Design a protein around this ligand. Structure first.
Ligand SMILES: Nc1ncnc2c1ncn2[C@@H]1O[C@H](COP(=O)(O)OP(=O)(O)O)[C@@H](O)[C@H]1O
Ligand SMILES: Nc1ncnc2c1ncn2[C@@H]1O[C@H](COP(=O)(O)OP(=O)(O)O)[C@@H](O)[C@H]1O
Ligand SMILES: Nc1ncnc2c1ncn2[C@@H]1O[C@H](COP(=O)(O)OS(=O)(=O)O)[C@@H](O)[C@H]1O
Lengths: 197, 195
């Protein structure tokens, strides 16, 4: 009695043969672009017949992580539960795109060494945009509420964002287009033999 | 994101959206993990992508910080039911193989799938505690009566028989292959497994 192999799994998940289970881990300041890259990437893989799944704020915040507030331990448990689920989707044969700020190198390496110890590729993607560009963009109003003292401890304002030193890609969203950053990430997945050339 | 409409075209080779949760529930040693294994081998044979949540990939991973106190079981299932919902939303057939004895935990698990629109199949693996105790596949029934395990379900914790499940499986009264086929017929009826 055993579970089905990743090789059999690699043959039934998509129309294109081979295991592709990996995890694409976006990280960056609120408003740097993680959501917009995630859909764009997700539309790409789907349009090219690669099943994927985004984990993001909307489908985690109020489900699996609904009992997790904004204390340091709670944001930590937040990235832990996301990481163990991303591993499961990866293990399932899918490409799992996570779009969480994840400000501390120390939770990101734990997520990475959760994947690497199951033999699953892990791609730290640094969505890099100057904080003042993020504060200008203010997509959800958060920076204005952080200045005002109504959001206490906000990444980039009152708690730090530890920038990836050694990530597989860096996306300079203040300098290039959405399509351009996606090309950087699709090309990564072609090198690592996830997306066929 | 990409709708379930378009995920049905890329996930699997069979065409159509199939995302759902087969949720096996019943006594420790009643055949949940056996059915989950054989059903998995069935769907992968028929080219239906799937994924199992069992004790192994959960106990020490996602739910590693959950004890065996009442709040912690509620949470155990709560987190499992959320992850099933994700794998179901993704276009996979998620199979869960936990005792999950309390009925409100199961009602909550179903609520989470239906409100999102995902099919939830409650599958009662049914075998008399005596046979399950007799089978004692892991040693737990032998430890439990001694008191090595306190609160074990069937001994010092109750088990709440699901009263309107989509299937009951007489693991003491029919073969693994018969019980798996009962689940296949339920999934063919609901346009999850092609004919
Ligand atoms: N190259 C780019 N990549 C991603 N987003 C960009 C880019 N250029 C401009 N933007 C804009 O930046 C904002 C990113 O917001 P969002 O994706 O919600 O950030 P986060 O990555 O924090 O979720 C969007 O308004 C998007 O239109
Ligand atoms: N119809 C059946 N379905 C599943 N298991 C069965 C059946 N009939 C007998 N068994 C036996 O019962 C035992 C079930 O144990 P297990 O699958 O570990 O159950 P659980 O996951 O509920 O603990 C196995 O040894 C299996 O061979
Ligand atoms: N350490 C943190 N400090 C402040 N806000 C956070 C932190 N972590 C996450 N957020 C906020 O989290 C929401 C995004 O979804 P979450 O699942 O809560 O976490 S997040 O990491 O992506 O940001 C947005 O409201 C996000 O901007």
């Amino acid at each position: 009695a055993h579970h089905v192999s990743r090789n059999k799994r690699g043959q039934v998940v998509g129309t294109r043969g081979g295991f592709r289970g990996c995890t694409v881990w976006l990280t960056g300041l609120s408003g740097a672009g993680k959501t917009t890259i995630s859909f764009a990437l997700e539309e790409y893989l789907v349009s090219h017949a690669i099943p994927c799944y985004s984990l993001d704020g909307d489908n985690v915040r109020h489900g699996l992580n609904r009992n997790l507030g904004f204390s340091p331990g709670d944001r930590e448990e937040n990235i832990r539960r996301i990481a163990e689920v991303a591993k499961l989707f990866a293990d399932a044969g899918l490409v799992c795109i996570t779009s969480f700020i994840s400000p501390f190198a120390k939770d990101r390496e734990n997520a990475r060494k959760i994947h690497e110890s199951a033999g699953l590729p892990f791609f730290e993607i640094f969505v890099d945009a100057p904080l003042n560009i993020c504060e200008s963009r203010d997509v959800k109003g958060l920076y204005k509420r952080a200045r005002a003292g109504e959001i206490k401890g906000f990444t980039g304002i009152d708690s730090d964002y530890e920038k990836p030193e050694t990530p597989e890609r860096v996306l300079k969203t203040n300098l290039s287009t959405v399509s351009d950053c996606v090309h950087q990430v699709v090309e990564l997945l072609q090198e690592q033999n996830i997306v066929p050339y």
